Design a protein around this nucleic acid. Structure first.
Ligand SMILES: [Mg+2]
Ligand SMILES: [Mg+2]
Ligand SMILES: [Mg+2]
Ligand SMILES: [Mg+2]
Ligand SMILES: [Mg+2]
Ligand SMILES: [Mg+2]
Ligand SMILES: [Mg+2]
Ligand SMILES: [Mg+2]
Ligand SMILES: [Mg+2]
Ligand SMILES: [Mg+2]
Ligand SMILES: [Mg+2]
Ligand SMILES: [Mg+2]
Ligand SMILES: [Mg+2]
Ligand SMILES: [Mg+2]
Ligand SMILES: [Mg+2]
Ligand SMILES: [Mg+2]
Ligand SMILES: [Mg+2]
Ligand SMILES: [Mg+2]
Ligand SMILES: [Mg+2]
Ligand SMILES: [Mg+2]
Ligand SMILES: [Mg+2]
Ligand SMILES: [Mg+2]
Ligand SMILES: [Mg+2]
Ligand SMILES: [Mg+2]
Ligand SMILES: [Mg+2]
Ligand SMILES: [Mg+2]
Ligand SMILES: [Mg+2]
Ligand SMILES: [Mg+2]
Ligand SMILES: [Mg+2]
Ligand SMILES: [Mg+2]
Ligand SMILES: [Mg+2]
Ligand SMILES: [Mg+2]
Ligand SMILES: [Mg+2]
Ligand SMILES: [Mg+2]
Ligand SMILES: [Mg+2]
Ligand SMILES: [Mg+2]
Ligand SMILES: [Mg+2]
Ligand SMILES: [Mg+2]
Ligand SMILES: [Mg+2]
Ligand SMILES: [Mg+2]
Ligand SMILES: [Mg+2]
Lengths: 185, 156, 148, 127
RNA sequence: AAGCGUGUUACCUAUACUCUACCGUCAGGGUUGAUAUGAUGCCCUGACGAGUAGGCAGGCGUGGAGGUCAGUGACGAAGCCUAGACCGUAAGGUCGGGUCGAACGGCCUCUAGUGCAGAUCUUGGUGGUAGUAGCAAAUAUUCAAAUGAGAACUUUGAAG
RNA sequence: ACUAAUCGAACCAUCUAGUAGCUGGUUCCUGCCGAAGUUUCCCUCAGGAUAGCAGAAGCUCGUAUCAGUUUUAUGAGGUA
RNA sequence: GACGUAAGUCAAGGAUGCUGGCAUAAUGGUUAUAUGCCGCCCGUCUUGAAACACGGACCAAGGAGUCUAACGUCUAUGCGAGUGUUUGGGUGUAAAACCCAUACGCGUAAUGAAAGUGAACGUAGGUUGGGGCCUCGCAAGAGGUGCACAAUCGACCGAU
RNA sequence: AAAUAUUGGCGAGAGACCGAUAGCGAACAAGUACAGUGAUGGAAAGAUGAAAAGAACUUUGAAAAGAGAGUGAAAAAGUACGUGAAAUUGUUGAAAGGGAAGGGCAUUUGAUCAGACAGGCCAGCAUCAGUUUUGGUGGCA
C-alpha cells in the first residue's frame, strides 16, 4: 500500500487533439505538431494548443481588433495570427495594409483586408513563411463576452444575469429585487 | 469476404539477434576430482560401480575406465555431477591417455579398435592396482546405501 | 440515438443510475413549480429573485406595434448605403451632394449616438434621434431631417 | 512453419463461467458480473470463482496467435485466400463454415499452391 | 507443562515489503531531406492498479436501414444438438461432426419496441410430492346360463 | 342486517395507464475515477430544496499565490 | 567502463555454449473422478443478511428511463453582425432531391413602474500582472510591445 | 363556393412498422366458442409434401395397432405431420456415492483431442547476468 498524496491515474485535463473530425484541421495539427517538436520557438507550441480549442474557446477576432493591435508601437508590420475566425467590422473606416494568417475568414473580412492592400493566408502558409513565428502577433477574441458567461456565478449580491426566457415587467423584478417588495438581492 | 482484412500488415522480417556477451570459459572441477581418483557412478547402466578417473575431456565430461577386466566398465564418458569423488587414488602416470577425446566417443557389435585400446590402458592400470591390497576386490564390488547410512555425514 | 445513451450502459445494473436508497420515485418534491415559497424557497431566492409578488402598473390591451422603434447607432449608420456606392461618398466629403439616408426604409425608429462617424456630411431622415447622435451628425457637416 | 514467437502464456486457461451457472439451468455459462450487495463473488471472498480482469491480458507479442504461431484469417473464396499470399508466416487461412464442399476443394488446392496454412482442411470431405 | 511471570535465539507464513516478467491506466518524451509508406502509427522512460451509491470511457451482442465485399448457399442458407478444436481478460467470436431444407453474413455508417434470474412478474409447458392422500354416508349381495377377445358391474333365470 | 356466494353504500363499463414522499423489480462486458448519512430552510421528521462530498468537460499558464507539518517571533484562551 | 603497448578481448546498455531422448498422446489442453486445503443462497431493504427478514419448485418466450414541447451546460458543423431554404411558392426521375421572394424569430442596446431618455475627455482611459512577438545579448537577462484573462481606480448610458 | 377538419364508409398507393405470447381482441367457421339473470365480459387456435403420390399387398392381434412391403428427394415429413430447444422422462454406456449436492487452487488416474521434422517436445551439464538464501575462511578498528 502507498499513502497517495494526489489522485492516481489522473488525465491532464488538456486537449491533446481537436475533438473536431475535420480532416484538414487534422493536417494542420499534424504540421504544427512537427514544428512544435522540431523547433524551439514558443510560437509553434502556442499555435498547436490553440488548434485544439473548442468553438467557445476561439471567439471571432474582428478586423477592428486586428487594426487596433497594429496601432501598437513597432507592430505596424507584423503578421497578425488568429487561430480562429476573422470577422468583418463596419464600424472602422481605415484598415491598414497588413498580412493576416487565420484559420477562417468571413467573406466580408477577406474583402476588407484585400481591399486595404493586405493579404489573407492560411496557417500552413504562415508555417512556410514564418517557421519560427518570426514577426508574428497572436490575437485572441473576447472569451468572457459570451452570453452564457452572464449567468455564470448566479447568486445574491453577485450582480449576474438570471437564467430567464421572457424579460420585462412581471418577470423577476419583484420580491427579492427591491426593498419595497420584501428585500433586495 | 468472411473476414474483411488486416488494415495494415505486420512485417515478416526475421530480426537478427543482438550481440550476446556470453564468452565460453573452461570449467573448474572440484579439487576432489583429480586423475587417478576412484569414483562411484551414481546413475546410468553402471549404477554404483567403482571406476578409475583418467582424464578431463573437452566436452566437460570425465574419461573413466574402471578396468574392464576388473568390473566390466569400459572406456567411456561420465558427467562430473553424477559421480562421487572418493579418497582412494591410483598412480596413473604410466597410462597412455592422450588418444581419447570427444571424437573418439562419437556414436555416429563392438568396434575392433575399441577393445584393443581397452586392453592397453587396463594393463598399465591393473598393475598399479595390484600394488595396494584389496583394490581389485574393491573395484569389482558395487557401492550401495545400507540401513543406517547417512551420506551427509559419510566421509567417502 | 438510443445506442449512445447511458440507458444502454445501465443494462445489467440494478438501479439504472438512480441509487438504491433514493429509489427513483414519481414526484418526491411535488410537480412543476410546487412549494416555491415553502420547500423550494432557497432555490427561488438564490436563482430567481423577484419571482414572487407584483411590480408596477398594468397595461390593458397592449399593442407592441405602438412601441416599435428599432434603434440604430452612428457606427452602423453608413451600413445603410450599399458598399460599392459607399466608397465614392467617403471620398470627397462635400456638401451640395450628400448621401440621403432614410433610416425608416431600412427599418429603424430612433438614431442613437454610439458615435465616431467619418467627417463626411450625411443627410439623415430619422423618426427620432438622440441629442448626442444629433451633435455628431452636425459635427460631420450633416443634418438630421425629421420624418414621420 | 510460422515466424519465431516467444512461448505463449495464456495466463488463465480456464473459462470464466458465471456464478451459479451450474446451480440453475436458467443461468447461462456466459460471464456476467455479480452486482449484488452481499455477493461473495463480487466481494472476492476466498474460495470463490475468479472474475475476469485486465491483469489476465495476454502478451501483445503472442496475443491472437494460435498454438502453431499463426493468426487466423477467415476466408470464403480464392480471392479472400490470395490476400494472404505474402503473409504465409503470420497468417493461416480458415475456411468459413458455410463454404460448400466443391468450393473447399478449390480453396485447398489454391492454398497448397501458394503455401498458405489451412486451419480446417477437413470440413466437408469424402473421408 | 503443552500452565503462569520474565529473558534469549531459531523457525512458520499475508493479496504487505524488495526484485523481475506480463496486462492495463496515467504522465513525460522521441519519431518526416523515403518516418525506409498505419503519426488517433511505431517506439522510449517513469509511476500507478481495492471499491457500494454514482459518473465517465473503450468495446461485445440483437431487430431493421444506406453503401460495399460483382460476400455465403439446394454440391446445403438459417436454426438446433454436440464433457470436439481454436481466438478474446470478458461481453463474445470462429471452426469440425450430426440434424435440417431456403435464405443468410463480414466491413463502413444509420436507427431502435436492442441484451433478464428475480418484480407473491405475464403466457404457456413440466416436475418432486406420487403410484401417494384418497375412490369408507344412503343395511347387500350370491349362484348358474347366455353374449362376448375380455364379465364383480350387460341380459335372463334362481335366491337373498 | 338483506339488496343474485358482492354490502358501514351492489354490479357493469368509462373517465383511468386516476395519484402514491410508500413496497417490489429495473436486462451485456471491461477500464479509470469514486461518495454521503452532515449545514440551513420547509405542515419539515420514510420527503425535498440548499451548501458540502463525487465524476466529466476542460481552460489559463509552467514550479508558482502554496501546505490537515515543524521552527522562530508575537498574540489570544480560563479547561486539567 | 575494464584488461591489453597496440590490435583486440571482456563477466562492460537483459543467455549463451555443449549433449541426449522422443517426435507421440510423451508434454500439454479439455473432461470425469480422487486427494489436501478452502468455499453458507442469490437478489433486496438495511448501521448490520447464511439468517429463525422478504421474492424465488423448474423451463421457454415476453418483460421495465421511452417519445414529444420548451429549455440549461458542454461539444461538433455551417455562416457570421448577422443568422434560420422546407408557412408558403417554383420544380421534380414525385412524401425525396434541387431552387426562391417578402416577412417573421432570435441577435446587433440598455434602463425605468412609467412618461421617457439612451452609451468615446483620452491612441475606447490609467495602474498591477500577463502568453506570444520585437531589439540588444554566447547565454542568464535587460528593454519595448503587450491579445485573451484577473484585480483596481476612472469615463460614458439608463434609474434615483 | 374555395383554402380548413376527418381513429366512420367506399376506392387506392405506400412504410428504416409487427411477424402468430408480436401486430387489431380476432392471419384460422372471431366479437366466434364459452361465462354471466343482465348490463357486459371474451379466448385459444397459422406451416406434411412439388404433387396425396395419405402407405396397395402379406403377416400377428378381437381390435386399436405392430412387423414387413411400398410412395416420396426425404417417412430423421405418416394429417398425434416444416424445423423440432429447454424444463421433465425412458433405454444404453461411462463414472462416483458413510447425514446433502454443487464450487476455487493444484496434481494423480481414466477418457478424449489439436499442432510439428523443410526446429517441434522433455531434459542434463558448463560458463555468465539479475534477485536471493546458506555456509567456510582472511585482513583491519
Ligand atoms: Mg455500479
Ligand atoms: Mg437482477
Ligand atoms: Mg431499487
Ligand atoms: Mg410553512
Ligand atoms: Mg480462454
Ligand atoms: Mg454490505
Ligand atoms: Mg498451542
Ligand atoms: Mg478499480
Ligand atoms: Mg425492429
Ligand atoms: Mg445447415
Ligand atoms: Mg423449402
Ligand atoms: Mg424492451
Ligand atoms: Mg426467465
Ligand atoms: Mg393407497
Ligand atoms: Mg350404502
Ligand atoms: Mg352506493
Ligand atoms: Mg404506470
Ligand atoms: Mg392504477
Ligand atoms: Mg481509487
Ligand atoms: Mg471532486
Ligand atoms: Mg470554559
Ligand atoms: Mg471450511
Ligand atoms: Mg424502506
Ligand atoms: Mg433493522
Ligand atoms: Mg443478502
Ligand atoms: Mg417486505
Ligand atoms: Mg415463497
Ligand atoms: Mg414465479
Ligand atoms: Mg427473452
Ligand atoms: Mg430539400
Ligand atoms: Mg420571443
Ligand atoms: Mg394475437
Ligand atoms: Mg350458472
Ligand atoms: Mg408449426
Ligand atoms: Mg429432409
Ligand atoms: Mg429430425
Ligand atoms: Mg421433415
Ligand atoms: Mg416434426
Ligand atoms: Mg432434455
Ligand atoms: Mg473437491
Ligand atoms: Mg487428466
Amino acid at each position: 500500500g502507498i499513502d497517495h498524496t494526489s489522485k492516481q491515474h489522473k488525465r491532464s485535463g488538456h486537449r491533446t487533439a481537436p475533438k473536431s473530425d475535420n480532416v484538414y484541421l487534422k493536417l494542420l495539427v499534424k504540421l504544427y505538431t512537427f514544428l512544435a517538436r522540431r523547433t524551439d520557438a514558443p510560437f509553434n507550441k502556442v499555435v498547436l494548443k490553440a488548434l485544439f480549442l473548442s468553438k467557445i474557446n476561439r471567439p471571432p477576432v474582428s478586423v477592428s481588433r486586428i487594426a487596433r493591435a497594429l496601432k501598437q508601437e513597432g507592430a505596424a508590420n507584423k503578421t497578425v495570427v488568429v487561430v480562429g475566425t476573422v470577422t468583418d467590422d463596419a464600424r472602422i473606416f481605415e484598415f491598414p495594409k497588413t498580412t493576416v494568417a487565420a484559420l477562417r475568414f468571413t467573406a466580408g473580412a477577406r474583402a476588407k483586408i484585400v481591399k486595404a492592400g493586405g493579404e489573407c493566408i492560411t496557417l500552413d502558409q504562415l508555417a512556410v513563411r514564418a517557421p519560427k513565428g518570426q514577426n508574428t502577433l497572436i490575437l485572441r477574441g473576447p472569451r468572457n463576452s459570451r452570453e452564457a458567461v452572464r449567468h455564470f456565478g448566479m447568486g445574491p449580491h453577485k450582480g449576474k444575469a438570471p437564467r430567464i426566457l421572457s424579460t420585462g415587467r412581471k418577470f423577476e423584478r419583484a420580491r427579492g429585487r427591491r426593498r419595497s417588495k420584501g428585500f433586495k438581492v | 469476404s468472411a473476414q474483411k482484412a488486416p488494415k495494415w500488415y505486420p512485417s515478416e522480417d526475421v530480426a537478427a539477434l543482438k550481440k550476446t556477451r556470453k564468452a565460453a570459459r573452461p570449467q573448474k572441477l572440484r579439487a576432489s576430482l583429480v586423475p587417478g581418483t576412484v569414483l562411484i557412478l551414481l546413475a546410468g547402466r553402471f549404477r554404483g560401480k567403482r571406476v578409475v578417473y583418467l582424464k578431463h575431456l573437452e566436452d566437460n565430461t570425465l574419461l573413466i575406465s574402471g578396468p574392464f577386466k576388473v568390473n566390466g566398465v569400459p572406456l567411456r564418458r561420465v558427467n562430473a555431477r553424477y559421480v562421487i569423488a572418493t579418497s582412494t587414488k591410483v598412480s596413473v602416470e604410466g597410462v597412455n591417455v592422450e588418444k581419447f577425446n570427444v571424437e573418439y566417443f562419437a556414436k555416429e557389435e563392438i568396434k575392433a579398435e575399441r577393445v584393443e585400446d581397452q586392453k592397453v590402458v587396463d594393463k598399465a592400470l591393473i598393475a598399479e592396482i595390484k600394488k595396494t591390497p584389496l583394490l581389485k576386490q574393491y573395484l569389482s564390488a558395487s557401492f550401495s546405501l545400507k540401513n543406517g547410512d547417512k551420506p551427509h555425514m559419510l566421509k567417502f | 440515438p438510443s445506442r449512445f445513451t447511458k440507458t444502454r450502459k445501465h443494462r445489467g445494473h440494478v438501479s439504472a443510475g438512480k441509487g438504491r436508497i433514493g429509489k427513483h420515485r414519481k414526484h418526491p418534491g411535488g410537480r412543476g413549480m410546487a412549494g416555491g415559497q415553502h420547500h423550494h424557497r432557497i432555490n427561488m431566492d438564490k436563482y430567481h429573485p423577484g419571482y414572487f409578488g407584483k411590480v408596477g402598473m398594468r397595461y390593458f390591451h397592449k399593442q407592441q406595434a405602438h412601441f416599435w422603434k428599432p434603434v440604430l447607432n452612428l457606427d452602423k449608420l453608413w451600413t445603410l448605403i450599399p458598399e460599392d456606392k459607399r466608397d465614392q461618398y467617403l471620398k470627397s466629403a462635400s456638401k451640395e451632394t450628400a448621401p440621403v439616408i432614410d433610416t425608416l426604409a431600412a427599418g429603424y425608429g430612433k438614431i442613437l449616438g454610439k458615435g465616431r462617424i467619418p467627417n463626411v456630411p450625411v443627410i439623415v431622415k430619422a423618426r427620432f434621434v438622440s441629442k448626442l447622435a444629433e451633435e455628431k451628425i452636425r459635427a460631420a457637416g450633416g443634418v438630421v431631417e425629421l420624418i414621420a | 512453419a510460422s515466424l519465431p514467437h516467444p512461448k505463449i502464456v495464456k495466463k488463465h486457461t480456464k473459462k470464466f463461467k458465471r456464478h451459479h451457472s451450474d446451480r440453475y439451468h436458467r443461468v447461462a455459462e456466459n460471464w456476467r458480473k455479480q452486482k449484488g450487495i452481499d455477493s461473495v463473488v463480487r466481494r472476492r471472498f476466498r474460495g470463490n470463482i475468479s472474475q475476469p480482469k485486465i491483469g489476465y491480458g495476454s502478451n501483445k507479442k503472442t496475443k491472437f496467435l494460435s498454438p502453431s504461431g499463426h493468426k487466423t484469417f477467415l476466408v470464403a473464396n480464392v480471392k479472400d485466400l490470395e490476400t494472404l499470399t505474402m503473409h504465409t508466416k503470420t497468417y493461416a487461412a480458415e475456411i468459413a463454415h458455410n463454404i460448400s464442399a466443391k468450393n473447399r476443394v478449390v480453396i485447398l488446392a489454391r492454398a497448397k499452391a501458394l503455401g498458405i496454412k489451412v486451419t480446417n482442411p477437413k470440413g466437408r470431405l469424402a473421408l
